[PDB]
Amino acid sequence: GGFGNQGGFGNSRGGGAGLGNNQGSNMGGGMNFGAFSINPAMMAAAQAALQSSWGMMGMLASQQNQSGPSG
Amino acid sequence: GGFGNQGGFGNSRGGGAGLGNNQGSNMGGGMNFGAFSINPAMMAAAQAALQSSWGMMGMLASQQNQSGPSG
Amino acid sequence: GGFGNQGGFGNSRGGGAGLGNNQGSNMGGGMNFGAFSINPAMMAAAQAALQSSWGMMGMLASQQNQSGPSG
Amino acid sequence: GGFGNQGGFGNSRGGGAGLGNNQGSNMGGGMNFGAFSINPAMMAAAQAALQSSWGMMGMLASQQNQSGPSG
Amino acid sequence: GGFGNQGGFGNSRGGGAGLGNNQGSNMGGGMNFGAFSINPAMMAAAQAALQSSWGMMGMLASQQNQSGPSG
């Protein structure tokens, strides 16, 4: 319906195999035989994130605003 | 319906195998034979996150606002 | 209905196997044979989180506000 | 419907195999026999993220705003 | 419908094999026998991200705004 978000993320309907395998949004995982130094950032400063919708990996949202801020 | 969010996250309807396997949003896991240094940040400063909707991994939301702030 | 959020998180309807396996939003886990240094932060400062909806991993929410703050 | 977002992410409907395999948006994972130094950033400064929708990996969103800020 | 975004991400409907394999938007992963130094950035300064929609890897969004800011 209105403001509708329907994310399937079907991935492995049948199946999933393999020594290293992964479905969906992935920011690492599975098997690691060494260093894993993964630091993602999404920071806000001053008049940040106004009237926005931050998604780094696959998001789903619906939004509605009418509002005047001040500082 | 209105402001509707329906996330399936179907992933492995049939099945999931493998030495290293993972479904959905993943920020690490499974098997680790070494260092795991993973620090994600999402920080807010000053007039931050106004009229927004932060999702780093796959979110679902519905929102409605009319409001004037001050500082 | 109105302001509706219906997250399936179906994951392994059939089954899930494997030496390292995990479904849903994952921020680590399973098997760890070494260091695990994972520090995610989501901090608010000053006029932070106004009129927002923070989700880092896959959220579900519905919201409605009309309100003028001051400081 | 209106403001509709329907992400299939079908991936492996039949199946997925192989020594190193992965479906969906991927920011690393699977198998790692060495260093893994992956730091993605998406930062906001000053009048940042106004009237926008940040997605680095495949997002889904719907948005509606009418609001005059100040600083 | 209106403001509609329907990303299939069909990927391997039949199957996916091979020693190194990956579907969807990929920013690394699979198998790594050495150094992995991958740092992508998307930063905002001054009057940044106004009236925009940042996607580095394949996004999906719908947007509607009428709002005059100031500083």
Classify residue A37 by its DSSP letter.
E
Calculate the CA dihedral of residues D48, D54, D56, D57 and round it to 10 degrees: 170
Find residues 7-36 of chain B whose CB sits inside 8 Å of chain A: 7-36
Burial (CB < 10 A; 0-12, 13-18, 19+), residue A57, is buried
Q: What are residue D41's DSSP bridge partners?
A: A41, E41
Residue E13: burial class (beta carbons within 10 Å; 0-12, 13-18, 19+): middle
| Chain A neighbors of B28, CB-CB under 8 A | 27-29, 36, 38
B38: which 2 tokens? 């993973």
Query: Can you tell me the distance from the alpha carbon of A1 to that of A5, in angstroms, rounded to the nearest whole number?
Result: 9
Q: How many CB atoms lie within 10 A of CB C19?
A: 15
Tokens describing residue A70: 């001040």
Residue to test with chain E: of D9, D37, D50, most E Cβ within 10 A: D50
Chain D residues touching B22 at Cβ < 8 A: 29
- Closest CB from D46, D60, D62 relative to E47: D46
Asked if residue B23 lies in contact with residue A22, where contact means CB atoms within 8 angstroms, the answer is yes
Q: Is C41 helix (H, G, I), strand (E, B) or coil?
A: strand
E46: left (phi over 0), alpha (psi -120 to 50) or beta: left
Token pair for C11: 């994951």
Q: Which of D16, D36, D59 sits opposite E60 (nearest CB)?
A: D59
- Name the CA dihedral angle for D13, D15, D17, D22, rounded to a multiple of 10 degrees: 20
Which residue from D minimizes the CA distance to A15?
Answer: D15
* Calpha distance B14→D51 (Å, rounded): 41
Q: How far is CA D36 from the centre of its chain?
A: 20
List the chains bordering chain C where 3 or more Cβ pairs fall under 8 Å.
A, B
CA distance E28 to E44: 24
| Contact status of B70 with chain D (Cβ, < 8 Å) | no
User: With an 8 Å Cβ cutoff, is D71 touching chain B?
Assistant: yes
Q: Select from B2, B13, B38 the Cβ nearest to the Cβ of A36.
A: B38
User: Which residues lie closer than 8 Å to D32 by C-beta, 6 or more apart?
Assistant: A31, A32, A33, A34, A36, E31, E32, E36
Chain B residues near residue A52 by CB distance under 8 angstroms: 51-53
**Whether E and C touch (3+ CB pairs < 8 Å), yes or no:** no
CB-based contact B1 C5, cutoff 8 Å = no
Place of tokens 């919708």: A53
Instruction: Looking at chain A, list the stretches that DSSP marks H as alpha helix, in order from N- to C-terminal side.
Output: none
Closest residue of chain C to B42, computed from CA coordinates = C42
| Cα–Cα distance measured from residue E54 to residue A45, given in angstroms and rounded to the nearest whole number | 17
Q: What's the CA angle centered on C41, arms C40 and C46, to 5 degrees?
A: 170
> Token pair of B58, please?
């796959």
> Solved how?
cryo-EM
Non-local CB neighbours of A2 within 8 Å, separated by 6+ positions:
B1, B2, B3, B4, D1, D2, D3
Nearest CA in chain B to A50: B50
Residue with token string 């395998």: A21
Would you tell me how many other CB atoms lie within 10 Å of the CB of residue D16?
Answer: 31
- Quote the tokens at residue C41: 């932060």
- DSSP letter string over E5-60? B-------SS---SSB---SSBSS-EEESS--EE--B----SS-STT---BSSS--
Structure token digits, residue D18: 């192989």
Cβ–Cβ of B12/A16 closer than 8 Å?
yes
Instruction: Report which of C36, A32, A22 is spatially closest to residue B12, judged by C-alpha positions.
Output: A22
Interface contact C5, partner A, CB < 8 A: no
Q: Which residue of E has its CA nearest to A62?
A: E62
B20, amino acid identity: G
CB contact under 8 A, D67 and B47: no
Cα D40 from Cα E45, distance rounded (Å): 17
Please tell me which residue of chain A has the smallest CA distance to E40: A40
Best of D22, D23, D51, D56 to substitute, by most chain B Cβ atoms within 10 angstroms, is: D22
Cα within 13 Å of Cα(E13), Cβ side: 4
Name the minimum distance, in Å, from the CA of E39 to any CA of chain A. Answer: 9
Q: What is the DSSP string of D34-49?
A: S--EE--B----SS-S
Distance CA B31, CA D42 (A): 28
* Residue D34: partners with Cβ closer than 8 Å, 6 or more residues away: A33, A34, A35, E32, E33, E34, E35, E36
Q: Residue D48 — left, alpha, or beta (φ > 0 → left; ψ -120 to 50 → alpha)?
A: beta
